[PDB]
Amino acid sequence: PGIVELPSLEDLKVQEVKVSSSVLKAAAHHYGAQCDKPNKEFMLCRWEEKDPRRCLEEGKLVNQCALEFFRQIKRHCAEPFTEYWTCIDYSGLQLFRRCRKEQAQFDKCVLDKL
Amino acid sequence: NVWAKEPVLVASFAIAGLAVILPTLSPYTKYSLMINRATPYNYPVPLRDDGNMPDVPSHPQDPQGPSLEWLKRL
Amino acid sequence: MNLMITLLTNFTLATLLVTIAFWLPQLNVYSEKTSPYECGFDPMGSARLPFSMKFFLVAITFLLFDLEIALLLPLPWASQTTNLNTMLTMALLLIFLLAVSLAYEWTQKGLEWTE
Amino acid sequence: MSLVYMNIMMAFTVSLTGLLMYRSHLMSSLLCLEGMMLSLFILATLMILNSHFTLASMMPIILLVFAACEAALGLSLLVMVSNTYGTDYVQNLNLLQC
Amino acid sequence: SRGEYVVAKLDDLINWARRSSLWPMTFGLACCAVEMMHMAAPRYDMDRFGVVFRASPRQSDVMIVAGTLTNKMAPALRKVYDQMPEPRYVVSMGSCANGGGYYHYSYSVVRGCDRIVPVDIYVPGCPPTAEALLYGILQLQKKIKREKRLRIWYRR
Amino acid sequence: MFMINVLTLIIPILLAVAFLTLVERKVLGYMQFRKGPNVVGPYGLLQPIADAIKLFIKEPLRPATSSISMFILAPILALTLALTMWIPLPMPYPLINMNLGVLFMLAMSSLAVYSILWSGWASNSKYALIGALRAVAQTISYEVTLAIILLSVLLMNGSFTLSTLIITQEQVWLIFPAWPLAMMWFISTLAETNRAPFDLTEGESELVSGFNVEYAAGPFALFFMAEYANIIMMNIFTTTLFLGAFHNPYMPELYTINFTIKSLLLSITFLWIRASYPRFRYDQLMHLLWKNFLPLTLALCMWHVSLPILLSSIPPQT
Amino acid sequence: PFFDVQKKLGVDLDHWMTIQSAEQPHRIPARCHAFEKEWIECAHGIGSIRAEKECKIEFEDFRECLLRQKTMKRLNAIKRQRDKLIKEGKYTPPPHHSG
Amino acid sequence: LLQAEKDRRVLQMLRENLEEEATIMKDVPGWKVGESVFHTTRWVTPMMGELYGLRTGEEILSSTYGFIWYT
Amino acid sequence: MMTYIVFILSIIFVMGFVGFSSKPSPIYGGLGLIVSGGVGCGIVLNFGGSFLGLMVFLIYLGGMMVVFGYTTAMATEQYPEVWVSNKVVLGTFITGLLMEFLMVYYVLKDKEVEIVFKFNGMGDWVIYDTGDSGFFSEEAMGIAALYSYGTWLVIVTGWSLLIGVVVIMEITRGN
Amino acid sequence: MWFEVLPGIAVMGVCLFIPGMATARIHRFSNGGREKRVAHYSYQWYLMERDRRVSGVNRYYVSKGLENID
Ligand code: SF4
């Protein structure tokens, strides 16, 4: 039948945001809050085309938005965010009521300072 | 009388009858319907830019669209 | 296959209990211990004789109510959709039909014989 | 073609031949009817799970509740047959001669 | 003598495990059965010694023949006796069972249960006292203390 | 280390069964105005160990026409399935985190019934036939009602996942939203567990042990251990399913202590119900079970359907 | 006959269970959603014999979405040629787990 | 982000696996290298053998069967 | 080492189920049926089915308990026969076993078998789900139908069961 | 009174204690101290899969803590 083509490995070089899955699930509220405004264009591409291998440029754009988000939260306030995600990391699957004081302290950090 | 022919059976018919009757007069079926409507399992998709819809807002921070606040508000 | 691993370990445990019952303790002198015992006297024949039973309706009754258990058992996934009316309506209709069939065969002495 | 489908269709055909040829027990005939129910059950369920066509997963539950009430009807018929005779053999059914 | 020392240790172990429980069967023909029921009394327990009533004969450890054995009963007595776990012991309880007693003459009485089964432990009385019955069970346990089964088996 | 967890599940059930036999005899003695095993060993303990050895010794042996395959495969499946019931039980974090556990409980309980059934058929001496059909009748009675009461008590809060059930057991125990349903279920567990002849017609004196008329002197230990594991099994499942403790978070020892204390005192209550009441009747079991439990269970089920719509208590079902 | 009191009363009680691309209960896809949308858009106002004259290609695309039969044929040929070349000993390949 | 990560990963497996195919089958006749199975030209959803073929047992076993009977 | 595990469990299912449908004494048939139902539950469970196999295990197995009750109550022979007793029973059991081993042979040493269809010989990790990020868990919402959309269907099913109850009672009542 | 039945209950309850404490010890011994990430649905399994993908040693519980920002 017909032929198909694929993007070569020239196009598939975008650095992954190689943090663990628990912290990535943990900071997800403010991950969707500040970033993830331009990625709805990626999502709209993905639904209105139903064609991945085509929307990969805005996939690069959302990956660099996520890495810039993590760069901003590492360079500025604060340090006990590490304590917060390792407090949400432990309790088997993530329950957002296992750790509330550290959520409040991280929120006070990023709210009063950023 | 009608009570103690088979008394645990008539008590079962009584709790059965109130189980039939009571959800008709019910001030919380609308709350169950609202809460069960407002738990999204899948992704709320974006849409094409608009034909200037003065609704369905530009940022989900903006309370133009359908938000929910009555969870903490009883 | 981890529950299959547990099934394997329990199979090995049960077979080692079989072998420690059979082969370890002592000898095996047979030839009268094998006789069928009822209560002290050698009976006529054995089992597998046609053993006519009391209940007839009750096993079929169990079968059909187990079938309506099968239709009723997805009640938690019933309770979360936007059609509350059809949910509660068909749930009440199924349990009420179960009670109706039970009420018929209760009033028509379908259980009041050789129970 | 999903090779497990071959063995399940094989089990269906063997259960059908077992339903057809039978020695003396109508109990065994109802038992092979139950087995054929199970074969169609497992094949239809593996179909629905290959297709991800999970709106219609009504085939398993409804097929087996209906065919099980069929088996219950057959069991009551066997109760009646063994009531009006001594046993339930294929022999001593040769009356009502054609 | 590491081999015979291990044999002595294991034989002592299995003999102790034998003499622990000795759960009987509740055979009990005549009023020595009533005396057995009053050996099941709170004032004289048997479950202090693991003597536990187990009615099925294929797992009872001993058989307490109690009550007057008759000729109409004796085939049932031995056809119960012959199917049992392979160690088996007989406690003959009462003057009827262990030598006929008062009915020693007088047809359809087996002249003591010695004519049917091997009988280890005799306890005589009409009735035996419950204290004497428990003493008979203790001396049965001392017979279990002197088995030397595996010692005989190894030095064979 | 998974083999080590298999070992730490298969080893303590054996000591559990053996010292449960001890506590049966001793509680039954102190109930019945007498005294239990006191002389032998330290107070009783090494005499149930000696009972294990004593029943190992007795050299099992076959009946006349008892076909050997079915014969020796019945109690092996009994003890194997009686072990594999304890797979998903949430002693703080269970062995296999099943996405559905209670229907698995019903399945393996029915398999224990089949084990009793196959032993009663294969022993083949007409009394095992009598006792096997008595067991078949009391299982006609007791897999409808227990399963539907289960469906009721999981409808409000459970949703088949026992970890979410121990999430639910925080504010109030589930004994308070369903106490009469719980009493009917406790009666059904005492029946289906086939102990406490209040609701048991298998080990009667009217018969002589219809499940074990002449099986063999060896695997009497297997069948015995299977039924007492059934007792510990359904009492642990009762202790989890209804009540318990808001556990020490990410700390297991406090929850394990409190759960063990609740479960074992409830098992003493179970044994104390066994030590009290006369035996039961075949036709009275059919009549009593169906025509007293069943419409009340249906009424509790329909009211626990309507209560998440009467008070918006629909579960947060994952 | 084929009576559609179904249609005449105006109650859709049996149409919701019909094919894929009907309303699966939450807004999910099936495995072969688009290929049925192709075939049903081809074969509506069509008299069921020119559905096999004309809409043949798209229906066969749907059948090969469902069974994936030629795909399994190609993959099996690749596996068996892989087996015969590694049996011969021509360049046991390293591409997995490495570069 | 998870969607785009899955996209890059399956495109990586498809490109490298068609290179594997073009290396491994290039001697037997017939066999065009990368033609579609289907008569149309759209992004067909793969089958976990187009992705996970010939990954030597353990990898495909932990990929396709892990969620079923583990954790 | 194993990757054909659903095919393997299906072979165990076909063995137990041919020995089932070869008609020995029905108690041995029920032994075969409980073995076959258990491994069929295992097949559909290890395929990806969440609960429906354990469900049918429960239902179908209680049905087999009722079938045991009637095959003990009604009619057995003076000596019931097992698989390896008779000429015909042993012959059908071993030839069903031979068909099983022969198809295993002609799949494992071949490419394909075309007795009724072109059967592809390799285990069914193909074709299979490519990790859908669902979280709605297809069988749960699937049986969460019959209640939201399933209006007429449960009506006629429950009505069939009610008619089944009155039919059984009147057939035994017809004396 | 019940003064003598308590040692049997206590020994048999420590026999019921040891599966829970042993199981918790094995869970925390098996995964780097971490309480075991139970995976209910395929979302959680795919998240655990990318977790064990980004580790390097193919064990998810390392979890590479906030250091591959660069
Ligand atoms: S010895 Fe005396 S007490 Fe015993 S059975 Fe004979 S008459 Fe009765």
Author numbering:
A (entry chain A8): 1 to 114
B (entry chain A3): 10 to 83
C (entry chain D3): 1 to 115
D (entry chain 4L): 1 to 98
E (entry chain S7): 24 to 179
F (entry chain D1): 1 to 318
G (entry chain S5): 1 to 99
H (entry chain AM): 73 to 143
Paper text:
CI is an ∼1 MDa membrane protein complex with 45 protein subunits arranged into two “arms”: a peripheral arm that extends into the mitochondrial matrix and a membrane arm that is embedded in the IMM (Hirst, 2013, Sazanov, 2015). In mammalian heart mitochondria, the majority of CI is found in association with CIII2 and CIV (SC I+III2+IV; respirasome) or in association with CIII2 alone (SC I+III2).
Initial 3D classification identified four classes of SC I+III2 particles. We concluded that the most distinct class with respect to the position of the CI peripheral arm belonged to the closed state (or active form) of CI (Agip et al., 2018, Fiedorczuk et al., 2016). The assignment of the closed state was based on clear density adjacent to the CI Q-tunnel for the NDUFS2 β1-β2 loop (residues Gly52–Gly60) and for the ND3 TM helix 1 (TMH1)-TMH2 loop (residues Pro25–Lys54). The three major changes between the closed and open states—the ordering of the NDUFS2 β1-β2 loop in the Q-tunnel, the ordering of the ND3 TMH1-TMH2 loop, and the π-to-α transition of ND6-TM3—occur at the interface of the CI peripheral and membrane arms and were accompanied by a significant rotation between the two arms of the complex, bringing NDUFA5 and NDUFA10 into close contact. A major difference between the closed and open states is that contact between the CI peripheral arm and membrane arms via NDUFA5 and NDUFA10 is seen only in the closed state. In the SC I+III2 class containing the closed state of CI, the density corresponding to ND4 is of lower resolution compared with the surrounding ND2 and ND5. Surprisingly, the CIII2 MT-CYB that is in close contact with CI showed lower overall resolution in the SC class containing closed CI than in those with open CI. This indicates that this MT-CYB subunit has increased motion or is more disordered in presence of closed CI. The decrease in the local resolution of this subunit only in the closed state of CI strongly suggests that there is crosstalk between the two complexes and that CIII2 may be primed for CoQH2 oxidation upon the closing of CI.
